[PDB]
Symmetry: C2
């Protein structure tokens, strides 16, 4: 598989697989497809706050104004 540098690779593969962890009230809810949640992957996740916060940031549907960038210039040459 791809190793990458570190953060971007982790962020990319976690978002792509759809590993979302969010705290809801008293209990943390985990979104993990069958097979990807292998113990070593969890070690890749690291269980750290900053990236996990970004993992929810992927799902954020709240649309509280500052939701996503929305550049609109997605094309224009490439």
């Amino acid at each position: 598989g791809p190793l990458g540098s570190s953060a971007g690779a982790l962020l990319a593969h976690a978002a792509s697989l759809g590993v979302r962890l969010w705290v809801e009230g008293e209990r943390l809810r985990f979104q993990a497809p069958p097979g990807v949640m292998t113990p070593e992957l969890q070690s890749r996740l690291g269980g750290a706050r900053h990236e996990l916060i970004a993992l929810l940031r992927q799902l954020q549907p709240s649309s509280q104004g500052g939701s996503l960038l929305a550049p609109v210039a997605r094309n224009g040459r490439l």
Copy 2:
């Protein structure tokens, strides 16, 4: 008939599969074997405090005196 509140099946299968969730400092750590963490099983867990506390209770190696029952060296109620 179904009584409710008391979920022996939930406790048994969660312990058997080795599903453990514990809050460590800031971050809840999840122990989930690949394949068993299917979303519907998470729904079976319910994500509630009481049963999950028991899910840690199975792992408790702290040996703080009141660890387990140990029905050995004593014949029932003596």
